[PDB]
Symmetry: D2
């Protein structure tokens, strides 16, 4: 029967026998996402155009404000903030949340899909909360997911027991569970990478890509897709299968995507869905960070596709 995100979260909080603090965090997040969706869809824009009487900064304020008001967090790391934000002792909670309020911000002007990425850690070292508390490997994530503002708005949530997708019915401001226990196809038929950096790809990426266009056994070549918005390329991967890649290159010898609020959440989601997320040399989730804005290379998607690339990495080493 009808399952709303509000009901699902509360139920899981009950089975889990939690104190209701994490439930509060999850409900504040949901609220922040409906707010950003509305802003993203340009509601009320007639007022900027003088009918009479920023989107990334606004998103940052909504997230930070709604999260602090939940009384469940103590440390916040935003892609928009150079420093980790320590919550007032007044509003503190036991959770640390790393997030990208509006990923794909360069795409705003072209009206391409954008999203919000989040990762939630539980503060374990009980000392005054600080930046150090956010420096945990993703293998330590309690919950992670993202909201994609594409043709429709969807919220993907991942936790210990699985990945579930919720579609937003904008008519009643409610997220509906449209898919339970999501698992990615073992093998896909689409590869996703910015081939404009061909000149700077390592030999392993080079070989794999060419293997997709000219398959050794004359099978059907893979189709190519690259929206240029991580949340959008990763969501397509999750739903239809395949492989997404943002390896290291010249401008980004350590990749472009950040570990804490972009790489780790998508890797956590991928792994819970039955897929793989690697650096090419090691699992993304086992990297212990040193800088909150640390970057990391990432390859994620169907297990068989990711394994095939790993085998080529091993061969050129």
């Amino acid at each position: 029967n009808i399952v709303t995100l509000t009901r699902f979260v509360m139920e899981q909080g009950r089975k889990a026998r939690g104190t209701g603090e994490m439930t509060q965090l999850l409900n504040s997040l949901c609220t922040a996402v409906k707010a950003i969706s509305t802003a993203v869809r340009k509601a009320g824009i007639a007022h900027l155009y003088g009918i009479a009487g920023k989107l990334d900064v606004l998103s940052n304020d909504l997230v930070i404000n709604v999260l602090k008001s939940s009384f469940a967090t103590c440390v916040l790391v935003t892609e928009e903030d150079k420093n980790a934000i320590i919550v007032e002792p007044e509003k503190r909670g036991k959770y640390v949340v790393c997030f990208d309020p509006l990923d794909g911000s360069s795409n705003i002007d072209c009206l391409v899909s954008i999203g919000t990425i989040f990762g939630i850690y539980r503060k374990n070292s009980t000392d005054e909360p600080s930046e150090k508390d956010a420096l945990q490997p993703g293998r330590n994530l309690v919950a992670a997911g993202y909201a994609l503002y594409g043709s429709a708005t969807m919220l993907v949530l991942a936790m210990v027991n699985g990945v579930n997708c919720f579609m937003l019915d904008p008519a009643i401001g409610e997220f509906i569970l449209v898919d339970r226990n999501v698992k990615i196809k073992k093998k896909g038929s689409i590869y996703s990478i910015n081939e404009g950096y061909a000149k700077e790809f390592d030999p392993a990426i080079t070989e794999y890509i060419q293997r997709k266009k000219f398959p050794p056994d004359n099978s059907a070549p893979y189709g190519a897709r690259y929206v240029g918005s991580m949340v959008a390329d990763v969501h397509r991967t999750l739903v239809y299968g395949g492989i997404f890649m943002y390896p290291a290159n010249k401008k980004s010898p350590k990749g472009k995507l950040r570990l804490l609020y972009e790489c780790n959440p998508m890797a956590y989601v991928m792994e819970k869905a039955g897929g793989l997320a690697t650096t090419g040399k090691e699992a993304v989730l086992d990297i212990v960070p040193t800088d909150i804005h640390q970057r990391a290379p990432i390859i994620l998607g169907s297990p068989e596709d990711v394994t095939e690339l790993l085998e080529i990495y091993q061969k050129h080493a």
Copy 2:
């Protein structure tokens, strides 16, 4: 002071001393686009999931009905219909409309941007309306444009005087003019093509793509982007500059995109914005259609980029 689509179309109908038949038609399109936008964003989905107890199809039905009720059309060609729709003599006007109600339908499940494409012709000749009236070259278009259901919904309308972009304020259901007399960049920095077909690209396309990744003059390479929905790929091109391509290959020696309701509308917008739209051999708008579902290869975008490719084509002539 603010300009809405309704106000704009009306002032334009007035300066042109029209009978008001085309204004009625442009207002019918506006309404259809808002109705589709709403459906695309999933309003009401809670009911489909039993709160109280096909999208390409709904779109088709919406456009066809809203258009017939305009009393301004005589023939309608749809991507979804094998044969052209001849209007009941009662609601028969003088306009022929070609459209793709929801382009990128394959993308629906992944929530990737999708849109509506349309082209309007004035029925030439004085005899019982038939498919033959839609078979006019693109150069004979009265109006053409598209609606993109992406992060926000936008309608781009191109007519003899230029191209204008209207953003939908979903809060009041009104398209606000946000950019007027749009012109495209002379030279962009992004190329768009499905490189999964590399194995079957003609030698000219191969060389160009090669030149974008490894510039012979040691200039910075072009970035790559390919959403997978024409309306999104073309909209990005018009706004940020660059080039979009869908040449022939084993994927039909004639390309995949249809001439009447995909290629022509987009080529018209391009030319009006200052770009070019070619098949590599001739201008898209000058082709005399032979069938309403005729496909055609297409290359469009910034003039300097399109010309650079045309030069390579001539080389391999």
Copy 3:
């Protein structure tokens, strides 16, 4: 087949061979009403309460701006402004518009139904526009109507040919025609008046009210209803029949309601629907205004009920 306000106004402008100045004006009103509706229903209130960090006034500003930008008006009389607004010679059209942007403003805090009232005159005379152009008797109205923001938003438009009701589909921001050529019941069963002023009603009003509660012919008594917002009380009267009254008393020997932007528009709708609108002494539409904020007593509704009262008035003459 479905009729929208935009389509209707346009077909009507065409049958009447208008220049399209009044169509532009009616489309400007439509937009203003949708913008106000949205504000009334509190969309965006979360921001006023710090989610990310006057209504009568906003309404006034919306109508005045949207109307000026129509280039179809020369003089605007508002309930909120002491003096009439003369349009900048640039945006000067030939229409004079009288309106109450948000009637029942005192009701705002209790969330009782409220609405917008308007009357449109054609500037008679050929000299610099002034308040004097608004001082025309109601019988000289070109169009009049109201928008009611109640359980749903409805626009009622009355013109020489009749009265039509349009319901707002807030999902697509479009007014759909739901009732055409509306006529009122000959005799209703509800009387509407603020009986808190009993102490000061003239003897005729006293006797009538007495006759509705204790029918001398032993017929069933009339039911009583008095919302407190004229637009809601009048809309109920037009749809269900009955009588609405606001006679003189110590609450101004001339009544409370204004002639130009409250009484006249409503009297016009009434007469066009088949009812009557009198002061008890003369038809409201035949009064020659002396001042733009002139008040006048009013009695409107089903013809048999209004006539029954007029007879009682004559008795006490």
Copy 4:
């Protein structure tokens, strides 16, 4: 800072140290109300009007369906159902909810304010759940309140510690706490009753009403208001003060309003706000019902106004 209904309810559930079952009930109710609001505002009505591709019954289905899915109820009493609905042992919970899904249904066609009224009891006699479980005096209510669909949508919730009002921001489908610990003025200046039944009022009502129009000490007479929709007249009373009355008459020797799903909830709300709710002879909340559809006379509002009427009842006895 920003307080949503979701957050407020959860917080109160935590302080209360509840098992989260009642929180689930309250969250299901909230969802049902946003759904009914959307339906009431006529969203999607363009589809009934053939753009191509009941309100009281629909409301009943939404409430019943959303409540059963909460797994927190065992008995339901609807104004629309002749019999109390026993929930399947599968979906049972410990709560009994009495409700009027859409009060003021006769007013739908006139677009007057309407609302949903609810009352929540906790099943105490642990025997197979049945109708008898609903037959509890209102003094036993755990929570009660109503949703008013007027100019804006508001949800009033009352519990042991106070009455709080939440306004719906339709843009993000979220209820915001706009007023905390609401208390009604000790004395008001508006009386609300259907004077059309004058002929059948008892001597006590008769005297009091006339005392409001012709005050003994020449003070200012009370103003009169009567929307004809209980939720709307009761809300105005709560916010602005005064007295609402629906005494017994001929057609209704025991009043018209029902005890369990109309009278008790509003009486519970009134008492928590510091006002009074009486039958004229005794408190509404202390009546032990015998029939689930039992009717009862009711007088509620400011304490000083209600006391003054009670003194007149005592005098004529």
